[PDB]
């Protein structure tokens, strides 16, 4: 099935980013940066992959998307760009 | 006075609870029918000298206009009280047929001490009509009234369908309630029927849980 994908209109999960999502996007991006992936932010003398990823996240120039699965398997895809980071 | 006065007071206490439960189920029972004082009770159902005459007490009840909007198929209920402490297959078959003839939906039996296993054979024997067995002694106090017992609400086929749809649930995933549960017997919950339970909370003000029957 591909009824598994919930559409953009009709989305119930937090418009805010989970403490776990932040930690995982930050990590995932740090690990990718660390293995010489292209960096989308102007690294202003920056050199630590986690700091570079935190710079990427603050500017919301992270090309990743969170597939938030529900107890039944259906999911809501949220972008790092579109997620509020109040944390 | 002796102990006949206490058996009268006790029968009356259990009577108020049957009225309370028959109302709470969804039927048309006045607050006056419920709050029937002890002296007035004696006056109605007491013989030549003043002893309890249970045979008379037996009553039919009809659904409120509200009950027919939510559960249209919920028909009429018949309550029966027996003057024999032990109820035998002879006095039982009288009741079973009365529910069959009057095309009754549900029937409640308020037995004093016991129902013979021969009489008990006749309980499922007449579907769609469902027969309920209640001990007179248990009904004295309304459990539903207790401090700890929250409000349970029967959900219509639609109300349930919506719940499972709105929470992406399988009937399994739902918290369960036993068919024998004191509140489930009170509301006459049949298997599958979902109950909605509203309790107060120290975190939110109110909280609503749901329990599926077993």
Curated annotation (Swiss-Prot), chain A:
The gene is RPO26. One of its GO terms (biological process) is transcription by RNA polymerase III. Component of the RNA polymerase I (Pol I), RNA polymerase II (Pol II) and RNA polymerase III (Pol III) complexes. Component of the RNA polymerase I (Pol I) complex consisting of 14 subunits: RPA135, RPA190, RPC40, RPA14, RPB5, RPO26, RPA43, RPB8, RPA12, RPB10, RPC19, RPC10, RPA49 and RPA34. The complex is composed of a horseshoe-shaped core containing ten subunits (RPA135, RPA190, RPB5, RPO26, RPB8, RPB10, RPC10, RPA12, RPC19 and RPC40) where RPA135 and RPA190 form the DNA-binding cleft. It is found in: Cytoplasm; Nucleus. One of its GO terms (cellular component) is RNA polymerase II, core complex. The chain holds residues 69 to 155 of 155 of the full protein. Its main location: cytoplasm. GO terms for molecular function: DNA binding; DNA-directed RNA polymerase activity. Signal peptide: none annotated. This is DNA-directed RNA polymerases I, II, and III subunit RPABC2. It comes from the Eukaryota. The keyword Phosphoprotein applies. Keywords: Cytoplasm, DNA-directed RNA polymerase, Nucleus, Phosphoprotein, Ribosome biogenesis, Transcription. Belongs to the archaeal Rpo6/eukaryotic RPB6 RNA polymerase subunit family. Residues 43-64 are annotated as: Leucine-zipper. It comes from Saccharomyces cerevisiae (strain ATCC 204508 / S288c). DNA-dependent RNA polymerases catalyze the transcription of DNA into RNA using the four ribonucleoside triphosphates as substrates. Common component of RNA polymerases I, II and III which synthesize ribosomal RNA precursors, mRNA precursors and many functional non-coding RNAs, and small RNAs, such as 5S rRNA and tRNAs, respectively. Pol II is the central component of the basal RNA polymerase II transcription machinery. RNA polymerases are composed of mobile elements that move relative to each other. Present with 6090 molecules/cell in log phase SD medium.
Swiss-Prot record, chain B:
GO terms for molecular function: DNA binding; DNA-directed RNA polymerase activity. Pfam families: RNA_pol_Rpb5_C, RNA_pol_Rpb5_N. The gene is RPB5. This is DNA-directed RNA polymerases I, II, and III subunit RPABC1. Component of the RNA polymerase I (Pol I), RNA polymerase II (Pol II) and RNA polymerase III (Pol III) complexes. Component of the RNA polymerase I (Pol I) complex consisting of 14 subunits: RPA135, RPA190, RPC40, RPA14, RPB5, RPO26, RPA43, RPB8, RPA12, RPB10, RPC19, RPC10, RPA49 and RPA34. The complex is composed of a horseshoe-shaped core containing ten subunits (RPA135, RPA190, RPB5, RPO26, RPB8, RPB10, RPC10, RPA12, RPC19 and RPC40) where RPA135 and RPA190 form the DNA-binding cleft. Its main location: nucleus. Keywords: DNA-binding, DNA-directed RNA polymerase, Nucleus, Ribosome biogenesis, Transcription. DNA-dependent RNA polymerases catalyze the transcription of DNA into RNA using the four ribonucleoside triphosphates as substrates. Common component of RNA polymerases I, II and III which synthesize ribosomal RNA precursors, mRNA precursors and many functional non-coding RNAs, and small RNAs, such as 5S rRNA and tRNAs, respectively. Pol II is the central component of the basal RNA polymerase II transcription machinery. RNA polymerase complexes are composed of mobile elements that move relative to each other. The lineage of its organism: Eukaryota, Fungi, Dikarya, Ascomycota, Saccharomycotina. It comes from Saccharomyces cerevisiae (strain ATCC 204508 / S288c). It is found in: Nucleus. PROSITE patterns: RNA_POL_H_23KD. One of its GO terms (cellular component) is nucleoplasm.
């Amino acid at each position: 099935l591909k009824e598994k994908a919930i559409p953009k209109d009709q989305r119930a999960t937090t418009p805010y980013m989970t403490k776990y999502e932040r930690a995982r996007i930050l990590g995932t991006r740090a690990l990718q940066i660390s293995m010489n992936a292209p960096v989308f932010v102007d690294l202003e003398g920056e050199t630590d992959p986690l700091r570079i990823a935190m710079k990427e996240l603050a500017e919301k120039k992270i090309p990743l998307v969170i597939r938030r699965y529900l107890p039944d398997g259906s999911f809501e895809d949220w972008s790092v760009e579109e997620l509020i980071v109040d944390l | 006075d002796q102990e006949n006065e206490r058996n009268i007071s006790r029968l009356w206490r259990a009577f108020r609870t049957v009225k309370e439960m028959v109302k709470d189920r969804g039927y048309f029972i006045t607050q006056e029918e419920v709050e029937l004082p002890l002296e007035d009770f004696k006056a109605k159902y007491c013989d030549s000298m003043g002893r309890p005459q249970r045979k008379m007490m037996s009553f039919q009840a009809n659904p409120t206009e509200e009950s027919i909007s939510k559960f249209p198929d919920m028909g009429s209920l018949w309550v029966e009280f027996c003057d024999e402490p032990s109820v035998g297959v002879k006095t039982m078959k009288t009741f079973v047929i009365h529910i069959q003839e009057k095309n009754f939906q549900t029937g409640i039996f308020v037995y004093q001490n016991n129902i013979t296993p021969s009489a008990m054979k006749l309980v499922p024997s007449i579907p769609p009509a469902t027969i309920e067995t209640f001990n007179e002694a248990a009904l004295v106090v309304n459990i539903t009234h207790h401090e700890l017992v929250p409000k349970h609400i029967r959900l219509s086929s639609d109300e349930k369908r919506e719940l499972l749809k709105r929470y992406r649930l399988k009937e399994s995933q739902l918290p369960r309630i036993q068919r024998a549960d004191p509140v489930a017997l009170y509301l006459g919950l049949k298997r599958g029927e979902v109950v909605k339970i509203i309790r107060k909370s120290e975190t939110s003000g109110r909280y609503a849980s749901y329990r599926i029957c077993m």
